[PDB]
């Protein structure tokens, strides 16, 4: 019935993105992507603190997809044999079916194709939704990302401008709750299912254990910070599915952000810290005016600098002493100051 | 002094909404209305779990008030001598005199009438505020509802076009503090009064113990499902007097949305999830594309599925395959698959 | 090399704000601020808790510093020998080198100059960020205030029409982590270091024991209540530097309300509660429209009420029977009512 071309797209995983163009003058598609579940434990902190994540792809978050308002997006949702549990997705971008919760309800070994139109632009989250206390369970054991729909003349300033982005990037936030034994040591499981009863006890009080960025505390420190030059203008897309976040560049700005994540709406600009309410995401657009490291950190610092939510940029480039410099290096305290 | 017309109002429980015009040629009138305090033992889990609520008109919410911009509102606050402690009420939407808290203190055997001018268009919060402590304690025990005051043109999209409703919600998320004793079982009191010092406890660590919707967990699931057709455009008003939510529309969206609630503000278009601040209202226009349940969560999902805040709606109509569909049912992974 | 007239300022104590012009005809000036690093312990609550506070200048929180766009800011930063951790400042308004944090970190007995460009305009927190988990340590012990950058026009309502305010204050607000000893009373140590182990245990759990303007409980009320006048027109200036906020003006409203904080948007209207994001300043203005008491809350009311979150506004003037009046004292309910 629906007679349109296909394109297969590979999706790789966060914090990249497959690639796309932003504006396009090609008509709508049937775009086709693919996601494995895969039932794994994970090491999601700098101490070794291992969990039994529930992943799409292998990734926490799942990866970003990437296509246009008026596509339609073909899913096909694996669930291997290995895994043990049922698994579905819920799109957040598509209309009907509980986002396709309804539809894509899978036993392992099974697979299952759903189809859904991309009639709203942004960024959107899609996650597990298995049915009632399950659903909370899949998400924060790690089964959520995000998807982008694009305007087909790509971004707009929300005052007849365009914007281009020159990189993107995805971060994923994710809230962990890790069973504590009577010492406080967390506790470790042989599979998902037994350690379902302890962590809904975690869960119950609200208050996580670990917050981290792209699976892990650390993932996106050190020789896996994120890279940029000077004078490029860099999207970064944050989805939380569960918990409220604040995303805040350290040293930066938001130049153009979408907090609630929906590009029908114009961009609020030069935000110093903006707003992901906890089942969205946001995007936000910063051209880089200073070389050096950038932590991008969840406002919370607690959250950011003890429970695991800081992701680092690196950014090449000549300083502007124009915007900042150091006057004088520290001295001692003059002997004659009152 | 005040010569204009007067009009009575009877309330009817959430999450229905008395009868009103939306767009009016009426004039200015009086409006009048009565709230009758109410005490009592409540369920709110499906467990069977109670707490001494306290009330406006017997339920959490208590009801929503409507009315136009220019109005006066007249409302006559009654505290039956069967009830044990001072009550009184607060009115965001109001101006001056803590939002009539500071006029409508009564005790029990009492009655006062207040009336405030509705300057100020949007959805508020109403809320008991007898004093010091008192004010949460009154507030999360269930003494909370909301108040609309539209424009006399009705709503519209902040873009000159007119917008209207074919049915209307009042939502309004309740957190409980509910008290457990050693082995984590809920405790059971037979007054306020001999709840409140375990209740300050649980409320000073600022975990809910159950979040819901309309009082109870459950409340507007199965036969109390919110009904709707599709192509019918929908307002859900949601209110939280005390704490944050996030709502959430599962297989919908908000296609207008005033998440700070106030109608001299443009909506925004297209979200995914929304953000009422607690001691706030906001207002989210859908219009019904796909039959079926839907559910209306806050989208802390561990709150939606663990601590009871769920709503369901059923919506009628015919399923658009071309919004949606689900191309080929759970299969068997092929063989030949890699 | 940069030759533009230089003005040092005198910073005041909050809540109150050093002397500035809104709309000004001058050009780019350098302004010289002086801030000192006090470690200090300091009276938090109202039964005389203290804590081992981190300071700028001695206050929580640290001073408001007025600018306007185009500006250069040199701060002075000293870090006295009395003192016993390193301090550095890490501006929200500033571009590069971690907000200056990166440029800026002294040991006691030290100073150091920064300079930065006030590109950006908004209120904007600034903060103490030595590295690590010194970072929310020393954020949470009280180092943390908030810079203005006016457009050189002043404010404006986002449609061409000028906004002036009569008064301005700063509401600093504080989340504040003090250990307990096992029956639950609060502990005392003799120095921040001291303190350290027992604090981080607290704030790895995320739940305040206090949140406080101005420094303490009580600080804002009493003779300490903000004062105004009928007609005024008042910026209420609001930084939360770790934690969101939901500010309320209880019997007012907020007319014009930047609650990103940055006045390259327009502001939204009318609004009952707001939302400053953990790492942030935001800024209402409210025109006072009755005399009274006013109260000024987070809209956790639990928080404001139970943790210490409530300011007062004394407000003179003549009382306005058409907003709101007592229609009937409280009175005894008529026997014959049903
Ligand atoms: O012996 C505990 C010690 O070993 C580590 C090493 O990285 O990890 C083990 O213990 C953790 C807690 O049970 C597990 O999460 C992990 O799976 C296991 O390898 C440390 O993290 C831990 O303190
Ligand atoms: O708005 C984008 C997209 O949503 C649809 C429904 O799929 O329209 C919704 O929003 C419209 C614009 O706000 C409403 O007028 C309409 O009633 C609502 O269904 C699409 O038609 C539109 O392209
Ligand atoms: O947090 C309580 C308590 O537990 C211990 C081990 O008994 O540490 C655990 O908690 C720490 C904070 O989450 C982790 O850093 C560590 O991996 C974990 O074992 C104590 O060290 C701590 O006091
Ligand atoms: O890219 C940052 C990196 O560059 C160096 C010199 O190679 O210094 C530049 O950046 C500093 C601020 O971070 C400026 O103060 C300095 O003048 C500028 O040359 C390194 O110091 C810095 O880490
Ligand atoms: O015996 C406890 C058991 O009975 C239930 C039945 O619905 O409720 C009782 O106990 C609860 C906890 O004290 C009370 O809240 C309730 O008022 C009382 O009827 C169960 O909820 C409970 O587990
Ligand atoms: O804005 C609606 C309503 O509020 C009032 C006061 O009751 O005006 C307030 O807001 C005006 C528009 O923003 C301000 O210009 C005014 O100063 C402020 O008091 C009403 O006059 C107005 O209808
Ligand atoms: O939550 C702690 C602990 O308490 C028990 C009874 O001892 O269950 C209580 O808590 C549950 C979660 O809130 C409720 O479902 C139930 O109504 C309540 O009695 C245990 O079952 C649980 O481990
Ligand atoms: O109203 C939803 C209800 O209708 C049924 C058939 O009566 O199926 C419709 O909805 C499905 C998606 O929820 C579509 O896939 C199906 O093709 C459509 O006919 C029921 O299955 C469904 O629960
Ligand atoms: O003896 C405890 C009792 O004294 C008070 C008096 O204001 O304060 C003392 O104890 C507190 C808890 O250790 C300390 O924070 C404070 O520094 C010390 O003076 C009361 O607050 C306290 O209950
Ligand atoms: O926007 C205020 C201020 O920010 C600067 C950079 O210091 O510009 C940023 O924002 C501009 C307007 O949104 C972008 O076009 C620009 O690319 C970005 O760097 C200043 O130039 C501007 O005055
Ligand atoms: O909060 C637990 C418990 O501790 C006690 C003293 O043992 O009070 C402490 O906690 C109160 C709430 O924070 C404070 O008001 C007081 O300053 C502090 O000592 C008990 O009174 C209370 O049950
Ligand atoms: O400024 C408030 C203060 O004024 C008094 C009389 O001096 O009353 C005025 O305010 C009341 C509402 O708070 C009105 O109902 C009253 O009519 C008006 O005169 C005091 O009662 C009040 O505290
Ligand atoms: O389907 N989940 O356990
Ligand atoms: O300025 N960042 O914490
Ligand atoms: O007036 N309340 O307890
Ligand atoms: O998509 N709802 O959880
Ligand atoms: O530098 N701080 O401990
Ligand atoms: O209306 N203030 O809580
Ligand atoms: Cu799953
Ligand atoms: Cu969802
Ligand atoms: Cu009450
Ligand atoms: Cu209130
Ligand atoms: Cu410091
Ligand atoms: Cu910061």
Same mark, same amino acid.
């Given at each position: *019935?629906? +007679?349109?071309?296909?394109?297969?797209?590979?999706?790789?995983?966060?914090?990249?993105?497959?690639?796309?163009?932003?504006?396009?003058?090609?008509?709508?598609?049937?775009?086709?992507?693919?996601?494995?579940?895969? /039932?794994?434990?994970?090491?999601?902190?700098?101490?070794?603190?291992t969990?039994?994540?529930?992943?799409?792809?292998?990734?926490?978050?799942?990866?970003?997809?990437?296509?246009h308002?008026?596509?339609?997006? /073909?899913?096909?949702?694996?669930?291997?044999?290995?895994?043990?549990?049922?698994?579905?997705? $819920?799109?957040?971008?598509?209309?009907?079916?509980l986002?396709?919760?309804?539809?894509?309800? %899978?036993?392992?070994?099974?697979?299952?194709?759903?189809?859904? +139109?991309?009639?709203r632009?942004?960024?959107?989250?899609?996650?597990?939704?298995?049915?009632?206390?399950?659903?909370?369970?899949?998400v924060?054991?790690?089964?959520?990302?995000?998807?982008?729909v694009?305007?087909?003349?790509?971004?707009?300033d929300?005052?007849?401008?365009?914007?281009?982005? *020159?990189?993107?990037?995805? %971060?994923?936030?994710?809230?962990?709750?890790?069973?504590?034994?009577?010492?406080?040591?967390?506790?470790?499981?042989?599979?998902?299912?037994?350690?379902?009863?302890?962590?809904?006890?975690?869960?119950?009080?609200?208050?996580?254990?670990?917050?981290?960025f792209?699976?892990?505390?650390?993932?996106?420190?050190?020789?896996?910070?994120?890279?940029?030059?000077?004078?490029?203008?860099?999207?970064?897309?944050?989805?939380?599915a569960?918990?409220?976040?604040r995303?805040?560049?350290?040293?930066?700005?938001?130049?153009?952000?979408? /907090?609630?994540?929906?590009?029908?709406?114009?961009?609020?600009?030069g935000?110093?810290?903006?707003?992901?309410?906890?089942?969205?995401?946001?995007?936000?657009?910063?051209?880089?005016?200073?070389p050096?490291?950038?932590?991008?950190?969840?406002?919370?610092? %607690? /959250?950011?600098?003890?429970?695991?939510?800081?992701?680092?940029? +690196?950014?090449?480039?000549?300083?502007?002493? $124009?915007?900042?410099?150091?006057?004088?290096?520290?001295?001692?305290?003059?002997?004659?100051?009152?």
């Amino acid at each position: *019935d629906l +007679k349109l071309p296909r394109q297969r797209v590979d999706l790789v995983a966060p914090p990249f993105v497959h690639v796309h163009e932003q504006a396009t003058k090609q008509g709508p598609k049937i775009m086709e992507f693919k996601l494995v579940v895969q /039932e794994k434990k994970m090491v999601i902190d700098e101490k070794g603190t291992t969990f039994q994540a529930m992943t799409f792809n292998g990734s926490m978050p799942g990866p970003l997809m990437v296509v246009h308002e008026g596509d339609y997006v /073909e899913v096909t949702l694996v669930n291997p044999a290995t895994n043990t549990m049922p698994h579905n997705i $819920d799109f957040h971008s598509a209309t009907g079916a509980l986002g396709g919760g309804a539809l894509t309800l %899978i036993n392992p070994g099974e697979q299952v194709v759903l189809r859904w +139109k991309a009639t709203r632009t942004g960024v959107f989250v899609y996650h597990c939704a298995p049915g009632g206390p399950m659903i909370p369970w899949h998400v924060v054991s790690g089964m959520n990302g995000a998807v982008m729909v694009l305007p087909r003349d790509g971004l707009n300033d929300g005052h007849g401008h365009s914007l281009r982005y *020159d990189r993107i990037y995805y %971060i994923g936030e994710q809230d962990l709750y890790v069973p504590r034994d009577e010492k406080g040591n967390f506790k470790s499981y042989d599979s998902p299912g037994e350690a379902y009863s302890d962590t809904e006890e975690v869960m119950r009080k609200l208050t996580p254990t670990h917050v981290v960025f792209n699976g892990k505390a650390g993932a996106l420190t050190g020789k896996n910070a994120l890279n940029a030059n000077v004078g490029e203008n860099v999207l970064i897309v944050h989805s939380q599915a569960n918990r409220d976040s604040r995303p805040h560049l350290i040293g930066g700005h938001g130049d153009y952000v979408w /907090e609630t994540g929906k590009f029908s709406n114009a961009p609020e600009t030069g935000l110093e810290t903006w707003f992901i309410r906890g089942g969205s995401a946001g995007a936000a657009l910063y051209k880089f005016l200073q070389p050096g490291i950038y932590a991008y950190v969840t406002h919370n610092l %607690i /959250e950011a600098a003890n429970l695991g939510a800081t992701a680092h940029f +690196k950014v090449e480039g000549k300083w502007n002493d $124009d915007l900042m410099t150091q006057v004088k290096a520290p001295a001692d305290i003059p002997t004659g100051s009152t």
